[PDB]
A paper describes a structure:
To evaluate changes to the HG3 conformational ensemble along its evolutionary trajectory, we solved room-temperature (277 K) X-ray crystal structures of all HG-series Kemp eliminases, both in the presence and absence of bound 6NT.
This yielded [name], a variant of HG3 containing 8 mutations. Kinetic analysis of [name] revealed that its catalytic efficiency is >700-fold higher than that of HG3, and equivalent to that of the average natural enzyme (~105 M−1 s−1). Crystallographic analysis of [name] showed that its structure is highly similar to that of HG3.17 but with an active site that is better pre-organized. Crystallographic analysis of [name] reveals that mutations proximal to the active site are sufficient to alter the conformational ensemble for the enrichment of catalytically competent sub-states. We expect that the structures reported here, especially those of [name] and HG3, will be helpful to benchmark these future enzyme design protocols.
Residue numbers in the entry: 4 to 303
Write the structure that this text describes.
């Protein structure tokens, strides 16, 4: 049974998954995505180091394949991350002029978003901008441009494709008493009051065993920032306990503005954390107990 169809029946937009070309051509990934998921994200093919490995010169072969596949199969598309220190090529992190880096960042955003204009439901514009104590992470963008880089990125993105929902995303937003959770709420409220077009907060939900329960309180706190949408993305859970997965799903159902959930991958062996077997399908592409528990939870 399709978790995407069932979550849509409960009033949400999608249950999605991250993938890319060589997953769609191997294993049983394409068949599972076709049957069970409503939205696809590029795992790597839209990141900066994959799309702009040298200045002004873009690589789109991998991203084009995924966008075309999604359109042919009637799936929604999410994409990202436009500005994320973890996937920056060296040529960007060696720029020291504020004007130059601003133009480089705007060109990167505008080029990617224009190519797929109108085809992408959600863009992750800025990722992992916060330290664990809630201060802003001292990346090349903060050091060279200053805190204005976040407003600039979102303004540029809105102009490039007004149809897309624009998100900021971060991890370790899984507990309501963790300082980073309240910090992103504080800053997003301030940015939206200044007219910055942040449509969503995406919570990168990479969980250890037993941490699902905390999301029931953290996700409503994230929603208190007043963005139109929030989402769970990059979801995986060490051990893949049904209890942890059901708690995350119910957090989504309890938060009106939470539009859906994206899991990090299909089958355990293709996880970056494969030894923790943290996904919903096993190494033989069989649905795991957590998958069936989600199905039952969505039907009750």
């Amino acid at each position: 049974q399709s978790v995407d169809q069932l979550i849509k029946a409960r009033g949400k937009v999608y249950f999605g998954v991250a993938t890319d070309q060589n997953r769609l051509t191997t294993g049983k990934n394409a068949a599972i995505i076709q049957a069970d998921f409503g939205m696809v994200w590029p795992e790597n093919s839209m990141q900066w180091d994959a799309t702009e490995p040298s200045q002004g010169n873009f690589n789109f072969a991998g991203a084009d394949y995924l966008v075309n596949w999604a359109q042919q199969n009637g799936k929604l598309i999410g994409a990202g991350c436009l500005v994320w220190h973890s996937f920056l090529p060296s040529w960007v992190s060696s720029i020291t002029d504020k004007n130059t880096l601003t133009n480089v960042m705007k060109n990167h955003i505008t080029t990617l978003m224009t190519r797929y204009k109108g085809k992408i439901r959600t863009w992750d514009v800025v990722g992992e901008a916060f330290n664990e104590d809630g201060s802003l992470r001292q990346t090349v963008f903060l050091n060279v441009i200053g805190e204005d880089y976040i407003p600039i990125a979102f303004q540029t993105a809105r102009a490039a494709d007004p149809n897309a929902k624009l998100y900021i995303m971060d991890y370790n937003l899984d507990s309501a008493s963790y300082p980073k959770t309240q910090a992103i709420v504080n800053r997003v409220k301030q940015w939206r009051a200044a007219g910055v077009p942040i449509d969503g907060i995406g919570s990168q939900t990479h969980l250890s065993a037993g941490q699902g329960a905390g999301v029931l309180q953290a996700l409503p706190l994230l929603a208190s920032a007043g963005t139109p949408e929030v989402s769970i993305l990059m979801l995986d859970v060490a051990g893949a306990s049904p209890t942890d997965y059901v708690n995350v799903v119910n957090a989504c159902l309890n938060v009106q503005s939470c539009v859906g959930i994206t899991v990090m991958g299909v089958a355990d062996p293709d996880s970056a954390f494969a030894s923790t077997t943290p996904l919903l399908f096993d190494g033989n592409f069989n649905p795991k107990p957590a998958y069936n528990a989600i199905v039952q939870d969505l039907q009750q």
